[PDB]
Coordinates of C-alpha atoms and ligand atoms in Angstrom, one line a residue:
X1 CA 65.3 95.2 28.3
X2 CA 63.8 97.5 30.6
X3 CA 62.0 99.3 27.5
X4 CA 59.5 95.6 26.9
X5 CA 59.4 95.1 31.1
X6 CA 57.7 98.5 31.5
X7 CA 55.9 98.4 28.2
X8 CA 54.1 95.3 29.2
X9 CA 53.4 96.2 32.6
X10 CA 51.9 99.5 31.2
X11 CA 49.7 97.3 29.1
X12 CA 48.9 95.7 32.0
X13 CA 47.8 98.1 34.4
X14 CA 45.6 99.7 31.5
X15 CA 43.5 96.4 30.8
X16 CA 43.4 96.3 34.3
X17 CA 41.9 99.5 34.3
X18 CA 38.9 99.2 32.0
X19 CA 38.2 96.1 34.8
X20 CA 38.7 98.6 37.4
X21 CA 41.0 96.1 38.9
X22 CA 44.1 97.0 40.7
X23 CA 47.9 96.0 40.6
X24 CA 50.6 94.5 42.4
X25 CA 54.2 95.6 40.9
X26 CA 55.6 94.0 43.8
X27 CA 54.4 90.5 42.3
X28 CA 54.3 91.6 38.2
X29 CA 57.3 92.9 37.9
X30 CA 60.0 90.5 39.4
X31 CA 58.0 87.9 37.4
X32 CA 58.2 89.9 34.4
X33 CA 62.2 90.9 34.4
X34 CA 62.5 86.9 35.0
X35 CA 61.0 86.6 32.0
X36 CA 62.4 89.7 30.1
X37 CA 63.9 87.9 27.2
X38 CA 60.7 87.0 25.9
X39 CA 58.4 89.9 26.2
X40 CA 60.4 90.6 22.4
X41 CA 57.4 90.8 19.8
X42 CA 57.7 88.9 17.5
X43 CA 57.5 85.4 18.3
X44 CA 56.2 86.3 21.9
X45 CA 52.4 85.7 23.1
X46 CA 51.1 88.0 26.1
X47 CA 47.6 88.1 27.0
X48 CA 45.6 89.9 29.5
X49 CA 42.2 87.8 31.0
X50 CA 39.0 88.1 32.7
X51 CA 35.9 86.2 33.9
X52 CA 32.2 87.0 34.8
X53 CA 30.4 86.5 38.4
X54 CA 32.4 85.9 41.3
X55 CA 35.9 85.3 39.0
X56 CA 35.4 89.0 37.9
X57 CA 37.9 91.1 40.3
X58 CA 41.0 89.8 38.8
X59 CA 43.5 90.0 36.4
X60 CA 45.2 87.3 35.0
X61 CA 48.1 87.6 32.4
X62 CA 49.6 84.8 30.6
X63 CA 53.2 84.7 28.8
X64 CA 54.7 82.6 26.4
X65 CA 58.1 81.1 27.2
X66 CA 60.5 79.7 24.8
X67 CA 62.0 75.9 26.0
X68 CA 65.3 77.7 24.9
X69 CA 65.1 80.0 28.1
X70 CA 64.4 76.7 30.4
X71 CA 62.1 75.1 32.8
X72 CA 60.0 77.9 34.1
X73 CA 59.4 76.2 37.2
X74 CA 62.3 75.4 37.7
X75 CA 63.3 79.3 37.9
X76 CA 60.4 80.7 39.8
X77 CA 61.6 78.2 42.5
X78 CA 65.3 78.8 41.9
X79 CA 64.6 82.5 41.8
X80 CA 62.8 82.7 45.3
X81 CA 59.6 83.6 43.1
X82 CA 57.3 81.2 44.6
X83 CA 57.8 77.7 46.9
X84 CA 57.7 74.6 45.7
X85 CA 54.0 72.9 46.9
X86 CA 56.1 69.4 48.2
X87 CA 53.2 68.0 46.2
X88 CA 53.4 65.8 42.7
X89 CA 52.5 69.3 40.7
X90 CA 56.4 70.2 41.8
X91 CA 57.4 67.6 39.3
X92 CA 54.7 67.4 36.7
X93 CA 56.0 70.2 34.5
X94 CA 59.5 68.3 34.6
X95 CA 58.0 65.1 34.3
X96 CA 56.1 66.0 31.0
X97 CA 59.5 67.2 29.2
X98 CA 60.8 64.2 30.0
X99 CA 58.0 61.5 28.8
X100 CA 57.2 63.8 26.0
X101 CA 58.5 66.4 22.9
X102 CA 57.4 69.7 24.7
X103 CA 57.9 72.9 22.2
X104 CA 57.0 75.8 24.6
X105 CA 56.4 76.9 27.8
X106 CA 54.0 79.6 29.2
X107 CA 53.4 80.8 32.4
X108 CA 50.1 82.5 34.2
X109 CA 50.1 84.7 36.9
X110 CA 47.2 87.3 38.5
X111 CA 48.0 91.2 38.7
X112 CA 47.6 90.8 42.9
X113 CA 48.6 87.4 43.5
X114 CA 51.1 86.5 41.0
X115 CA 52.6 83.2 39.9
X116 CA 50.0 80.4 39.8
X117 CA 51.0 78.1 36.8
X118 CA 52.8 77.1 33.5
X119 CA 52.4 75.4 30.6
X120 CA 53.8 73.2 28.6
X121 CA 53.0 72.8 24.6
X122 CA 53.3 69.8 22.4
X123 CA 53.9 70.0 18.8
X124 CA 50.7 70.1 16.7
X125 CA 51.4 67.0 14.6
X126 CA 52.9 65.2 17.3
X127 CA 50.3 65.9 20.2
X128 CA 49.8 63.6 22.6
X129 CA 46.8 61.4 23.7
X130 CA 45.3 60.5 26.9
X131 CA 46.9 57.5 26.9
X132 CA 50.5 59.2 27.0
X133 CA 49.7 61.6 29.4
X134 CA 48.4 59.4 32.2
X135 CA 51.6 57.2 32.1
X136 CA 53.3 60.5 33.5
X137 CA 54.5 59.9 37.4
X138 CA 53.2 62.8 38.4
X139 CA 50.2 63.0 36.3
X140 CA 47.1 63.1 38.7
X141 CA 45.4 59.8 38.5
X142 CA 42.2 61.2 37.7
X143 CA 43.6 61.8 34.0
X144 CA 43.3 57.8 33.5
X145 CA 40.2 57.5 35.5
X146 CA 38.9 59.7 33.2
X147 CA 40.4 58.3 29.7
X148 CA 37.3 56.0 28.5
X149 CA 35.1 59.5 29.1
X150 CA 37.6 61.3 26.9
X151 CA 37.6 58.7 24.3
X152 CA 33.5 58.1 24.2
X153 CA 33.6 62.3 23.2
X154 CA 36.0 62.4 21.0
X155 CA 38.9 64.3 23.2
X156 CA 41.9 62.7 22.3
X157 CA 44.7 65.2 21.0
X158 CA 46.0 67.1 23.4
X159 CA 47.7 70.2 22.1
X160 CA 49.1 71.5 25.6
X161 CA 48.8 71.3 29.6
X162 CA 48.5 73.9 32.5
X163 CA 49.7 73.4 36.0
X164 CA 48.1 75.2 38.3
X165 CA 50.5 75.2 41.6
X166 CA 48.3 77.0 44.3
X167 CA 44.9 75.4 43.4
X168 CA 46.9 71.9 42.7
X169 CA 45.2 71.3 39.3
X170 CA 45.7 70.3 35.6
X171 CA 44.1 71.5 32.2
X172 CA 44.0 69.4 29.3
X173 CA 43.3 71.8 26.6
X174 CA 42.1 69.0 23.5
X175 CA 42.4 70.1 20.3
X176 CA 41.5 68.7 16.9
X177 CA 38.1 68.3 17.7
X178 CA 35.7 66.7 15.6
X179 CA 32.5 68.0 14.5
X180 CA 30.3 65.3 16.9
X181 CA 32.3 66.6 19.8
X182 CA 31.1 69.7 19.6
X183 CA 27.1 69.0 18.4
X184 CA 24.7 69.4 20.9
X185 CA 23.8 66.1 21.5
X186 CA 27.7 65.0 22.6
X187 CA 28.4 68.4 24.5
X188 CA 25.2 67.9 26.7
X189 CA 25.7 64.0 27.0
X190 CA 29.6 64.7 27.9
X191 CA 28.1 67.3 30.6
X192 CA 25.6 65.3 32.2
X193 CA 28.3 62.5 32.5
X194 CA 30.9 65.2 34.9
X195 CA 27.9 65.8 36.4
X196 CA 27.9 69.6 35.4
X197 CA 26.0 72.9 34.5
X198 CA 23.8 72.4 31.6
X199 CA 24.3 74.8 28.9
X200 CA 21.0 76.2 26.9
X201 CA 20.5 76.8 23.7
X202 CA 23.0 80.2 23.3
X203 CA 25.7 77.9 25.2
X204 CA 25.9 75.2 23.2
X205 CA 25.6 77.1 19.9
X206 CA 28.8 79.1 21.6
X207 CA 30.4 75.4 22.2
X208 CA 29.7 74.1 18.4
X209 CA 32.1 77.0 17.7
X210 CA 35.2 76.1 20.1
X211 CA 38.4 75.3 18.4
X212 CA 39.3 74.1 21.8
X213 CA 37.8 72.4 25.3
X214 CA 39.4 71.8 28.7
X215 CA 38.6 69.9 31.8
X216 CA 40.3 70.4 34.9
X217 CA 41.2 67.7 37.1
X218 CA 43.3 67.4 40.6
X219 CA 45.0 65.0 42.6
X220 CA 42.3 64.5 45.2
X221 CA 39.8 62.5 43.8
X222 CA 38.8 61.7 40.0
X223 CA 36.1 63.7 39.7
X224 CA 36.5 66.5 37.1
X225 CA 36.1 70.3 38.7
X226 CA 34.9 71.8 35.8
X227 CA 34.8 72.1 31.4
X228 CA 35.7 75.0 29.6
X229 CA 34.8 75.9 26.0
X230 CA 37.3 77.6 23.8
X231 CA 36.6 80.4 21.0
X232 CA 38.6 82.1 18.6
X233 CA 37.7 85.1 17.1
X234 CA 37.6 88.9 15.9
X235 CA 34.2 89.5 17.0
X236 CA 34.0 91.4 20.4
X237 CA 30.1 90.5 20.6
X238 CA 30.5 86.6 21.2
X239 CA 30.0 86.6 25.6
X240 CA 28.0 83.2 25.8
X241 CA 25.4 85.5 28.5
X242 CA 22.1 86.5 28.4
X243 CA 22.8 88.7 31.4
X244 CA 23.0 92.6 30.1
X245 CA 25.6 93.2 32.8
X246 CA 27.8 90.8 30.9
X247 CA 27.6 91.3 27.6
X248 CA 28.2 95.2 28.6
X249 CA 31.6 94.6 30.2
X250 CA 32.7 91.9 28.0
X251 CA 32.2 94.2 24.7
X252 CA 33.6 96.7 26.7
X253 CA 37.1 95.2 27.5
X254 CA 37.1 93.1 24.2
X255 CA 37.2 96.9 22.2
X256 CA 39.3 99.0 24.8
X257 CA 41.7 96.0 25.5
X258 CA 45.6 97.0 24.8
X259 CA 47.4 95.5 22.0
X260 CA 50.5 96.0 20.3
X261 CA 49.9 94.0 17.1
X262 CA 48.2 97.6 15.7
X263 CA 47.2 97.3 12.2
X264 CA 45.6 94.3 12.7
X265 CA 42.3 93.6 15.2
X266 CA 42.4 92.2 18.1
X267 CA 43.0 88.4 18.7
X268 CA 40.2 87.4 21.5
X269 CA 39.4 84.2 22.7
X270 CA 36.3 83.5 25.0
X271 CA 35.6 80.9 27.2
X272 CA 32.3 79.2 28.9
X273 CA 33.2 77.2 31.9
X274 CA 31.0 75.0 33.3
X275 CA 31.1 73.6 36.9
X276 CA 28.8 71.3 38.8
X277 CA 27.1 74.4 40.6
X278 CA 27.2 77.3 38.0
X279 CA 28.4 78.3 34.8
X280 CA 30.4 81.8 34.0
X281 CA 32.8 83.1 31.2
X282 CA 35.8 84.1 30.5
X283 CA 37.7 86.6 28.3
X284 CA 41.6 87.0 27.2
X285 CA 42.1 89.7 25.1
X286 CA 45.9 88.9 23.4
X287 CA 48.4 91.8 23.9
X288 CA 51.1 90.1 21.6
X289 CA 50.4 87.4 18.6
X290 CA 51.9 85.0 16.5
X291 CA 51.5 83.4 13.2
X292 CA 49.9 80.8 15.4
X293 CA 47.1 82.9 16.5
X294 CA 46.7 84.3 12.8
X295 CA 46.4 80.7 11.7
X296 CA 44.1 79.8 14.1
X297 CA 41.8 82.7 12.9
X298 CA 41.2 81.9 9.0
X299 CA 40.6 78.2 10.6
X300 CA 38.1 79.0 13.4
X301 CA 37.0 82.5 12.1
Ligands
GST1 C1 49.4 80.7 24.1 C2 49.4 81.1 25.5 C3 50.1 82.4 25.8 C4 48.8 80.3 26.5 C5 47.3 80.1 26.7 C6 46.8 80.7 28.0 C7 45.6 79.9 28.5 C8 45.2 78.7 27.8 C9 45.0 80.3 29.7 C10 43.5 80.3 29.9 S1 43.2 79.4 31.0 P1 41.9 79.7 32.0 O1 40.8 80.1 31.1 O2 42.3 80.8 32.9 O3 41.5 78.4 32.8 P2 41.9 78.0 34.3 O4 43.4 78.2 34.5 O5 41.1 78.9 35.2 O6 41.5 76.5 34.5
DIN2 O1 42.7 82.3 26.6 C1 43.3 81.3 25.7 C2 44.3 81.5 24.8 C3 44.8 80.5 24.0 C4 44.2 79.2 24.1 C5 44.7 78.1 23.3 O2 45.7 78.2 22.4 C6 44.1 76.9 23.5 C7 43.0 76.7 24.4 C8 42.6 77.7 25.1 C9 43.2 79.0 25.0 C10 42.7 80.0 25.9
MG3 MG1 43.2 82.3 34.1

């Protein structure tokens, strides 16, 4: 429909806006008409994000992608949308759907650079655990490397993996985390082990509230670039920054962001990263929902 194409992309350029970032409708909107079957609301999930310090002059929007309409990567490449890498990460979406039950797709893409990476989503009471993802071909080898870490913190469940195709990485976004994970004992332990950032006191208190955490690994070696720290939640105060520049911007775009779901408030999910030399945040402000998102509100907020 062209009605959905430009009403998204309007959406778009507006968040954009309050970031005083600018677009590129030469690589949103042939993405976006690829994808025009699913920007239907309803069952469709858009979201528009943002991150502090040097991550904070972009855009990027992530879209949910039915497995009915196909192997996304397999039609950004087909499609002339964006070359395949001739690296494993060409086959690691494809590989996953084929070692395991994937139930949705997603794809992410930046307002001025667009396509970067998909998705792929596992059922929640079938998710998979480290142990089945590592046996994937194309998996990087770092994710076995890494699975007696996972297992001494708790990360086991895996309730979805990102592919990022110009940086060559993988997110594994853990879900059903336990309590102990998330203490701050175990999330500083777990920290000093990857050798990264060390939150304080308002970070950790922020990570005892994530319904979900990711690392990010790569082919390269098996060290793990960085951790990121999930929340859920209706409040547009909840920034993990003592810097006033921060949590100015962030409460900013988290109560001017567009959404279409009106009647309801706005679904935001923040994120602390932390990397072995810094540590900054991140913001998605959801355009479209889901039950799923609903759900995951009453449980987390
Ligand atoms: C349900 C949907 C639409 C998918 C979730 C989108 C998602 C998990 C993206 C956030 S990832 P992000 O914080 O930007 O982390 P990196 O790719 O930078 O490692
Ligand atoms: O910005 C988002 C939106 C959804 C997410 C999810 O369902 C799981 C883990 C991290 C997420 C980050
Ligand atoms: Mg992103």
């Amino acid at each position: 429909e062209a009605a959905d194409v430009e009403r998204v992309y309007a959406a778009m350029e507006e968040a954009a806006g309050l970031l005083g970032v600018a677009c590129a409708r030469d690589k949103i909107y042939p993405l976006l008409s690829t994808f025009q079957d699913t920007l239907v609301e309803g069952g469709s999930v858009v979201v528009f994000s943002m991150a502090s310090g040097r991550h904070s002059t972009e855009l990027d929007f992530s879209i949910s992608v039915p497995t009915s309409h196909g192997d996304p990567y397999a039609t950004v490449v087909e499609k002339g949308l964006f070359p395949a890498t001739g690296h494993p990460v060409d086959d690691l979406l494809a590989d996953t759907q084929k070692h395991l039950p994937v139930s949705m797709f997603a794809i992410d893409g930046e307002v001025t650079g667009g396509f970067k990476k998909t998705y792929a989503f596992f059922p929640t009471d079938n998710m998979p655990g480290v142990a089945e993802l590592s046996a994937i071909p194309s998996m990087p080898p770092a994710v076995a490397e890494n699975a007696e870490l996972f297992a001494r913190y708790g990360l086991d469940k895996v309730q979805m993996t990102s592919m990022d195709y110009k940086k060559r990485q993988v997110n594994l976004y853990f879900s059903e985390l336990s309590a102990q994970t998330l203490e701050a004992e175990s999330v500083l332990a777990l920290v000093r082990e990857l050798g990264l950032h060390v939150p304080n006191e308002l970070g950790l208190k922020f990570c005892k509230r994530s319904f979900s955490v990711y690392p990010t690994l790569n082919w390269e070696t098996g060290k793990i670039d960085r951790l990121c720290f999930a929340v859920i939640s209706n409040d547009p105060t909840l920034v993990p920054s003592s810097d006033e520049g921060d949590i100015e911007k962030f409460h900013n775009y988290a109560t001017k962001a567009p959404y279409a779901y009106v009647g309801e408030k706005r679904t935001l999910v923040y994120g602390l990263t932390l990397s072995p030399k810094e540590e900054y945040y991140k913001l998605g402000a959801y355009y479209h929902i889901t039950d799923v998102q609903r759900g995951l509100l009453k449980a987390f907020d």
